[PDB]
Amino acid sequence: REIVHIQAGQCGNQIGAKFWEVISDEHGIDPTGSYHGDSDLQLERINVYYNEAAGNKYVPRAILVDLEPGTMDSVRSGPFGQIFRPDNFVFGQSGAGNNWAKGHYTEGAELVDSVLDVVRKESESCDCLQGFQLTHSLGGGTGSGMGTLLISKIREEYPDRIMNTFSVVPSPKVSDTVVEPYNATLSVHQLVENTDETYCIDNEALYDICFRTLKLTTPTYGDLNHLVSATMSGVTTCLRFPGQLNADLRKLAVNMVPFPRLHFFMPGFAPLTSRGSQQYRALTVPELTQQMFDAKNMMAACDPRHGRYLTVAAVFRGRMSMKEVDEQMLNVQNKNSSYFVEWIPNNVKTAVCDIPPRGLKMSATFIGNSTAIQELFKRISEQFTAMFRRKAFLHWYTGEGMDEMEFTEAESNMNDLVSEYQQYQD
């Protein structure tokens, strides 16, 4: 089986450097070097993310899509930056203006065909394709506009292969941009209707989970991104390992989406202990489910305690009893029968790999499909209307060849998407 990652925009790019920083060590792949793999198992399944050319040069099979040179020119000029075949860099030296319309209709729309070209070179690689990983932020031009286009085209070329999306939904408290709900409401719109698995991450839900669950006082971006990239490795690549009970992107999809909207999840890692001290090793297993199922520790902003679940997928990866796993999940389902929805007798999807995250004994990725994410598309959809009412920075969109009905459309769509998600919270 196989996948082809996609680094849309700067954020989705910056994260690409962290996703590949990680995964490669989780696969013994040095910069241009080969498989140094401490084991022999980190290689029978690598194909999922790489290609055979030389015999030491397994190249990451991703795409780097960006209208801002300086970005991909920082990712390519740094650490692992020299592993991507140059053919992967689909730059757009144009003005990467912070407009969703500037990266979806006017400036991104040109660069697309020179992207789809390569997304096909990589899909037609070999073996069988599974799907595509997509990283980006819903708060910018090249992220939410151009990266949401890339998928609307991917989902027309292979409506068979899956589409995981890792979105950096606009964080509440402070927005790292101004038009944010504009770039966002417009991309979530495309997402609800093309990708079929989304993992929404919040730069501040991370800061919290990175400043209190890691006593880490100076959580640089590299860190947030690192944490995120830790989950997306427990999702994909992980289940492309053996296991007593393994799954794969489809099992995860076919167990986690009760209704075709696509639905968006909220990833959570297991052993999230500060370095020295907290190395408590209280990781028997009740400690991992203790972790993953708390409020805090959900990379989403919203708190699960604020809304039922439809599905859960504890994708464990570390030798453990199929009894102390399958058991714990139950008491968890009964202690919290309140929030877990009822018309699914077993919400939880236990998954169990064998090999754990390189240096750790036992971990478990969490992929929650809670109705609590209603209280985020609410947030976004609010910020929209409060400014859309006055057409705030709208001239930057229309003046780029947009429509007054296009914003209407997306808000309403993604605003209905809130509605639906409540239909199951009840």
């Binding site: 009905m405 309403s412 209905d416």
Partner: protein, 333 residues
């Protein structure tokens, strides 16, 4: 009230004669039917026998259209049933027989013509298909026209061409262009399978005039729905485009089946019926969901292979009967 369910069968087919198998559904009376094994007696508002012609389907189907049109109530008509079962022979007609689309257009043209003076209508004609859940205008062949909502809400396709009926016959000529313009490919089951759902709508603003100036207008759009026949995996038997097309039909029909169950109970509570699930059900939200009346012509047939198809056509009848619509006014100023 509830949409009227009409059960329409087709003379014994070569396949049925070769099976020699009792008819799947035999009507004791035109209204009463017995389904096969068990001891199954269904009742309908109306049913038609295998002896019952398309011209009986004409009279019966168009009478509620007349009513709804004089009321200004939008008419919707759903031909449902698998491939082979008689949706096109009802809707289009036989080759010799006038079809319900011609007879209901003659009926509409009649409703406006009878009273030209009070009722001055404009007819616009919009024939579309839903192929792969993409909407395309049949009359303007182009790329699938973008889906928009109206300002308030309701989903409309922009760029569906209108025409006004020059004559009744002239609609048939253009409509046959629309009937070829939908995607079709031959199958083992049909001489020509419809790969798509086809939706003849018209925009009838019918100004009733009073006093010197003007009265109220009744607005009807009417809708003839030729659904594609369902196929199965084992029925398709061909992968590739044939499977993806057939799976795309089956997802849209499931979406519709979920909509019907949700209307019957869960909508009586709230919004929940999922109009969003298909492009057809998004436009059907302002069509049926906006106003009465609808009618479903469940085409069945007595073949043994059509047993699952026809049985689930009659399961669809029970689901559409479980749908109660209120009548709803439609007026413009």
């Amino acid at each position: 009230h509830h949409m009227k369910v009409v059960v329409r069968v087709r003379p014994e087919n070569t396949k049925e004669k070769a099976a020699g198998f009792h008819k799947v559904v035999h009507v004791v009376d035109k209204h009463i039917l017995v389904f096969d094994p068990k001891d199954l007696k269904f009742v309908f508002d109306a049913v038609f026998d295998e002896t019952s012609t398309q011209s009986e389907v004409f009279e019966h189907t168009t009478k509620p259209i007349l009513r709804s049109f004089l009321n200004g109530y939008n008419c919707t008509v759903l031909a449902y049933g698998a491939t082979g079962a008689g949706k096109t022979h009802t809707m289009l007609g036989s080759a010799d027989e006038p079809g319900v689309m011609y007879l209901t257009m003659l009926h509409l043209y009649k409703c406006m013509d009878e009273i030209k003076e009070e009722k001055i209508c404009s007819t616009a004609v919009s024939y579309l298909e839903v192929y792969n859940e993409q909407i395309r205008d049949l009359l303007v062949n182009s790329g699938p026209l973008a889906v928009r909502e109206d300002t308030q809400k309701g989903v409309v396709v922009h760029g569906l061409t209108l025409h006004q009926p020059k004559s009744s016959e002239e609609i048939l000529h253009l409509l046959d262009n629309g009937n070829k313009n939908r995607t079709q490919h031959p199958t083992d089951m049909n001489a020509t399978s419809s790969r798509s759902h086809a939706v003849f709508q018209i925009y009838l603003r019918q100004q009733d005039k009073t006093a010197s100036i003007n009265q109220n207008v009744r607005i009807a759009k009417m809708s003839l729905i030729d659904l594609a026949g369902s196929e199965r995996a084992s029925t398709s038997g061909a992968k590739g485009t044939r499977f993806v097309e057939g799976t795309n039909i089956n997802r849209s029909l499931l979406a519709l089946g979920n909509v019907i169950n949700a209307l019957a109970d869960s909508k009586r509570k709230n919004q929940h019926i999922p109009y969003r699930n298909s492009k057809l059900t998004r436009l059907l939200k302002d069509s049926l969901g906006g106003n009465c009346q609808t009618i479903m012509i469940a085409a069945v047939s007595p073949s043994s292979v059509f047993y699952d198809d026809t049985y689930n056509t009659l399961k669809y009848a029970n689901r559409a009967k479980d749908i109660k619509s209120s009548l709803k006014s439609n007026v413009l100023n």
